[PDB]
């Protein structure tokens, strides 16, 4: 029957509800009481990166720490050197329209998509000295909000559709499809063994999803808004999601439930990126005022402000060995704090 | 500087050059947005622009010296509420309604809230709204035998086929904007009629030169 | 990605002459050019250099005055008009591309040359003349430079290139450790300042050849005497 299915349901939601509340020993507050914190902490911005002419909507760090890609809706995709300031490529994009921006890991392509709903993949390494759209992958009904390199052959993507889609470059079909979210699916994060990977949905919830098997492993939900941005702890174990009524959380894995809260009275506006340290000590949150907090992930206090950008922030990394950070915001400047 | 590096800086110094050349050239043209609502017909709009002498899809329009884009959004499961920032710049909106829609359910009040939504954003604060009232002809067609007395609240005017019908409905249209700020370039447009790209050249004319009037101090 | 030379031919001493390299099937326009000639038996030796867009145009002290360089990109050319042929420059001029960023590999494809017959600087020596080869056996190259190759940025820049007979040279292996692509992984590079040493391990078919060591420093790039793997 139809009530059937409803009040298996709540009963499960009951159940789960009271299972995960029975495995609450004590909060993370009171066991990191006795913990010196961090004080202070000021940062300088070391370098300034100008050569977008319109906002800035995606940036990724590459796995040597030196070099990182850029997308501006100006229809360029530029590949800075961070060391010296300098412009590697400057590739020019069929759509103009881009919402995100990935770098692969081995550093040979690079991928963006936006509201064209095609995720195209650029060969940086190749002859003849030009760069090519090696692959289009299209796929998906809603503009693409995430896009992460897997491989250099395997591609993890999100849609505003609702939809999550693990695609093969080489063949360029969709090998698995995750479908568990109402909402639109605003950010993706991946595993540092790429086992696993979670997506927050703009229904207030977070899901983890096995990459081999496809289907959802657990369900986080404790935000009240959309959630823009998410991380995942160095560890592995927990995940950190940003959302839209200025509270950044921590999630655990194995404890199926949510750890801390960071929230400020003073800040009321969205979190629109996010992201760990090196050790998993700090938490890097950019915001819609134009400056970027940095919280302490085990004592829940603020600890640095970043206010440099004029306009609001929409891109923040940290590089691979923790020796910079790089924010980008809507005034085609993104700046390299250290 | 190593050998190797200044050959780097030049080539960076390159792309800075054809970075520059290419924000002039795309700072030359102008952006439209055009938002159709259900079942609006906005295909055969855009057929009959194009026509004469003329996943997101942008159609560019060269007209004398200016380059206009019209982007339109057709088809997107995304609410609207997540995308809509990237049009913060653009010059106008084109918002266009169908009129001989007052029956089907309404859909007309549906069309009247989405109007309202778009135009209170706080995106589109300098820019304006060019409402185009497509089916006119269909309008005058169907004005007999229908009597929107009942599906609208007052319609003061006569229950007959007079034009007080498009007024009224434009009336309506109208008086959702936020007052004094904001000027409305409504219009009628019919399934076959040429004079649309010179109405929207005239309406981005006017735009350009109100912005203008107020940002020289001239106002 | 092809490179055809043009000109050459007998010419009396002192007359002028023009060279033009037809480059067909990459991004010409993108790649800074340089022209390297030959001598009948010796090795390679550095003439001219023409960046992308030529902005910046170099040349060597024995060709500096009476040789100019240029290049037409619509036609994706290469220009060399020569002046007051003497008789050192009977050679075989081979024209090169090379792009400079973070991580790319000049140097890295040569093309075939013409032929001529006209009737301070970092000597860089391998004094190593020939050495013996057996198939199969690891065998190794020793270059030494003048003074430290080593740059502040940790950049040393050692370049190999092997000639086969009757062929271009070819990139083995640039910035001394990194291994160029298309290139077998049995070749390696591993020195210190001054010293640098090329290791071979499992020699195969299509080895024999010259071994030329060419430091990137201060632009008289300047190549090595060349070493001889004879069977």
């Known amino acids: 029957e139809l009530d059937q299915l409803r009040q298996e349901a709540e009963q499960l939601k009951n159940q789960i509800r009271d299972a995960r509340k029975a495995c609450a020993d004590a909060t993370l507050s009171q066991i990191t009481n006795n913990i010196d914190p961090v004080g202070r902490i000021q940062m300088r911005t070391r370098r300034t990166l100008r050569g977008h002419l319109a906002k800035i909507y995606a940036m990724h760090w590459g796995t040597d720490s030196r070099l990182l890609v850029s997308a501006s809706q100006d229809g360029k995709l530029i590949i800075w050197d961070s060391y010296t300031t300098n412009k590697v490529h400057a590739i020019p994009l069929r759509s103009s329209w881009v919402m995100t921006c990935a770098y692969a890991p081995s550093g040979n392509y690079v991928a963006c998509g936006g509201l064209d709903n095609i995720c195209s993949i650029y060969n940086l390494k190749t002859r003849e000295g030009n760069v090519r759209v090696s692959r289009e992958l299209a796929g998906h009904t809603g503009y693409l909000s995430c896009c992460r390199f897997l491989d250099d052959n395997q591609i993890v993507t999100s849609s505003g559709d609702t939809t999550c889609a693990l695609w093969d470059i080489e063949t360029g079909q969709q090998t698995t499809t995750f479908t568990g979210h109402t909402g639109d699916v605003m950010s993706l994060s991946l595993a540092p063994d790429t086992r696993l990977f979670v997506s927050g949905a703009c229904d207030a919830s977070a899901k983890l999803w096995d990459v081999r098997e496809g289907m959802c492993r657990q369900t986080f939900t404790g935000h009240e808004s959309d959630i823009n941005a998410i991380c995942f702890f160095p560890n592995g174990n927990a995940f950190a999601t940003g959302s839209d009524d200025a509270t950044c959380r921590l999630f655990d894995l194995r404890a199926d439930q949510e750890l801390m809260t960071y929230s400020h009275d003073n800040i009321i506006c969205g979190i629109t990126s996010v992201s760990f340290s090196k050790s998993g000590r700090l938490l890097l949150a950019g915001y819609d005022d134009f400056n970027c907090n940095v919280w302490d992930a085990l004592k829940a206090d603020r600890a640095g402000v970043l206010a440099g950008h004029d306009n609001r922030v929409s891109c923040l990394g940290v590089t691979d060995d923790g020796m910079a950070v790089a924010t980008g915001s809507w005034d085609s400047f993104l700046k390299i704090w250290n | 500087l190593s050998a190797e590096d200044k050959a780097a800086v030049e080539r960076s110094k390159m792309i800075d050059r054809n970075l520059r050349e290419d924000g002039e050239k795309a700072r030359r043209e102008l952006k439209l947005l055009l938002l159709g609502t259900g079942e609006s017909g906005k295909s055969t709009f855009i057929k009959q622009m194009r026509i004469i002498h003329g996943g997101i899809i942008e159609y560019p329009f060269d007209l004398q010296s200016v380059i206009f884009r019209m982007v339109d959004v057709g088809g997107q499961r995304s609410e609207r509420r997540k995308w809509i920032h990237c049009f913060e710049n653009v010059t106008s909106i084109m918002f266009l309604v169908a009129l001989s829609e007052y029956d089907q359910v309404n859909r007309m009040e549906e069309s009247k809230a989405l109007f309202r939504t778009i135009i209170t954003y706080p995106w589109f604060q300098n820019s304006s709204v060019i409402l185009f009232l497509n089916k006119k002809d269909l309008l005058e067609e169907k004005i007999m035998y229908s009597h929107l007395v009942d599906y609208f609240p007052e319609y003061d005017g006569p229950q007959r086929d007079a034009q007080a019908a498009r007024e009224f409905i434009l009336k309506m249209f109208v008086d959702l904007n936020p007052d004094s700020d904001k000027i409305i370039y409504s219009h009628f447009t019919c399934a076959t009629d040429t004079e649309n790209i010179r109405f929207v050249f005239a309406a981005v004319k006017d735009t350009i030169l109100q912005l203008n009037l107020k940002e020289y101090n001239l106002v | 990605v092809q490179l055809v030379e043009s000109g050459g031919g007998l010419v009396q001493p002192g007359g002028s002459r023009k060279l033009s390299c037809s480059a067909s099937g990459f991004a010409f326009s993108s790649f800074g050019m340089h022209w390297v000639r030959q001598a009948p038996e010796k090795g390679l030796e550095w003439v001219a250099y023409i960046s992308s867009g030529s902005g910046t145009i170099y040349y060597a002290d024995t060709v500096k005055g009476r040789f100019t360089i240029s290049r037409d990109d619509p036609k994706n050319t290469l220009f060399l008009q020569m002046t007051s042929l003497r008789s050192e420059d009977t050679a075989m001029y081979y024209c090169?591309?090379?792009?400079?960023?973070?991580?790319?590999?000049?140097?890295?494809?040569w093309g075939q040359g013409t032929t001529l017959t006209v009737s301070s600087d970092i000597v860089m020596t391998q004094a190593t003349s020939s050495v013996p080869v057996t198939p199969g056996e690891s065998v190794s190259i020793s270059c030494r430079s003048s003074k430290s190759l080593l740059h502040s940025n940790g950049n040393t820049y050692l370049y190999w290139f092997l000639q086969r007979p009757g062929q271009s040279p070819q990139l083995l292996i640039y910035r001394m450790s990194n291994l160029a692509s298309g290139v077998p992984d049995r070749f390696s590079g591993s020195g210190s300042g001054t010293a640098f040493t090329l290791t071979i391990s499992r020699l195969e078919a299509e080895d024999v050849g010259v071994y030329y060591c060419?430091?990137?420093?201060?632009?008289?790039?300047?190549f090595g005497a060349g070493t001889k793997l004879e069977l």
């Open positions: 060419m430091q990137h420093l201060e632009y008289p790039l300047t």
């Open positions: 090169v591309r090379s792009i400079y960023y973070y991580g790319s590999s000049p140097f890295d494809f």
